[PDB]
């Protein structure tokens, strides 16, 4: 009676949209676990689902990479089924009345840097770094930060040679303007530096509750750009956070980030503030 995709996954209601297409809840009846289901019309002009499924598979087994359960076709749609994950950092931030404590911001930072370094180690750049695209795990994996939504992800080097993409200009802002790097706002081809810089804005977003460039009425994107460029990093939180954003801006187009330095930057603060390494988040307490 009930709809089951490939007779395997009881269909649930809609959760959201991703870089492309709609996402749905489902239940894996045989495995007994909840799942997420993405559909793309096979009739679509520029198919995007196959590239993302190809990227997930190469990363499969990496810490915080969702596991693919099925990728088939049903009706007019292509389908990919992943294990269901928990709430996004955006949903946890709103759930906490838009207030995260420094300890939690720092605990998130350690994994978020680690997730981007992993992505980069596999020759892709994410290009859509925002709180919505980090999800906590379910159950015993609820302490693990996951990265999702590789639909705007791009290869930044070649697997064999490790030779970087070319400098390019006049490229529309891919991803979300609020967390976009200044280079991204300028139309510069995005590279590895831009994923970590966007994260730097994510950390200040968690600290501030909003960003200095968020309230504003092609022009809206222009307004966001001008406010960020016109806003000094120093324009009330521990200095380690400001050192991070300035470092990312100084990176060259092709430069490999010093990921270990950045993690150790926040951990030294984590230690000096004397927070416990118990991995208890604001929503745990
Ligand atoms: C934006 N977005 C959020 C999710 C999502 C939500 C909850 N749990 C999840 N577990 C794995 C992904 C995911 C997805 C998604 C879902 C399935 C898929 F094949 C591709 N992307 N997109």
This PDB structure is determined at a resolution in Å of 2.5
Which of the residues 128, 149, 194, 195 is marked catalytic? Answer: 128
Listing DSSP states for 180-220 in one string gives --HHHHTTPPP-HHHHHHHHHHHHHHHHHSS-TTTS---HH
Q: Is the Cα torsion angle 229, 232, 237, 243 positive or negative in sign?
A: positive
Tell me the best of 148, 150, 151, 153 to mutate to test the pocket of ligand 1, counting ligand atoms within 8 Å of each CB and taking the most: 148
Which of 231, 149, 150 minimizes the C-alpha distance to 185? 231
Domain check: are 79 and 98 in the same one?
no
Helix 259-272 with 102-121: angle, nearest 10 deg:
170
With 0-12 / 13-18 / 19 or more C-beta atoms within 10 angstroms meaning exposed / middle / buried, residue 210 is exposed
Q: In this structure, are 162 and 237 located in the same domain?
A: yes
Q: Are residues 65 and 195 in the same domain?
A: no
The boundaries of the domain holding residue 43 are 14-26+33-83
In a domain? residue 3: no
| Residue 25 alpha carbon to ligand 1 centre in Å | 9
113 & 232 share domain: yes
Which of 244, 251, 176 is CA-nearest to residue 207?
Answer: 244
Sort strands 33-41 and 22-28 into parallel, antiparallel or unpaired: antiparallel
| 249/229 Cα distance (integer angstroms) | 11
Half-sphere exposure of 60 (CA within 13 A, CB side): 12
Same domain, 79 and 101: no
Q: Does residue 110 carry a catalytic annotation?
A: no
Q: Does residue 257 belong to any structural domain of this protein?
A: yes
Read off φ and ψ for residue 125, nearest 5 degrees: -110, 145
Domain identity same for 242 and 135 = yes
Token pair, residue 231, equals: 């806003």
What is d(CA 101, CA 88) in angstroms, rounded to the nearest whole number?
A: 17
Residues 276 and 284: their CA atoms lie apart, in Å, by 14
For residue 73, give the 3-state DSSP assignment.
Answer: strand
Flag whether 73 is in a domain.
Answer: yes
> How many angstroms separate the CA atoms of 196 and 115, rounded?
10
Spatial contact of 179 and 168, defined as CB atoms under 8 Å apart: no
């Amino acid at each position: 009676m009930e709809l089951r995709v490939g007779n395997r996954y009881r269909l649930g209601r809609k959760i959201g949209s991703g870089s492309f297409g709609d996402i749905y809840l489902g239940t894996d009846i045989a495995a007994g676990e909840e799942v997420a289901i993405k559909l793309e019309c096979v009739k679509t002009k520029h198919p995007q689902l196959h590239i993302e499924s190809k990227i997930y598979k190469m990363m499969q087994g990496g810490v915080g990479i969702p596991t693919i359960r099925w990728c088939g076709a049903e009706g007019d749609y292509n389908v990919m089924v992943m294990e269901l994950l928990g709430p996004s950092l955006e949903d946890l931030f709103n759930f906490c009345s838009r207030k995260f404590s420094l300890k939690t911001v720092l605990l998130l930072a350690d994994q978020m840097i680690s997730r981007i370094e992993y992505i980069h180690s596999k020759n892709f750049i994410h290009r859509d770094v925002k709180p919505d695209n980090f999800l906590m795990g379910l159950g015993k994996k609820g302490n693990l930060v996951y990265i999702i939504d590789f639909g705007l992800a791009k290869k930044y080097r070649d697997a064999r040679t490790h030779q970087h993409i070319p400098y390019r200009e006049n490229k529309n802002l891919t991803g979300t303007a609020r967390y976009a790097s200044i280079n991204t706002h300028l139309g510069i081809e995005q590279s590895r530096r831009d994923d970590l810089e966007s994260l730097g804005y994510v950390l200040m977003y968690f600290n501030l509750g909003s960003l200095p460039w968020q309230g504003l009425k092609r022009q809206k994107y222009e307004r966001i750009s001008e406010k960020k460029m016109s806003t000094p990093i120093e324009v009330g939180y521990p200095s380690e956070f400001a050192t991070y954003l300035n470092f990312c801006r100084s990176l060259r187009f092709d430069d490999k980030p010093d990921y270990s330095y950045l993690r150790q930057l926040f951990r030294n603060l984590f230690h000096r503030q004397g927070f416990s390494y118990d991995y208890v988040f604001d929503w745990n307490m």
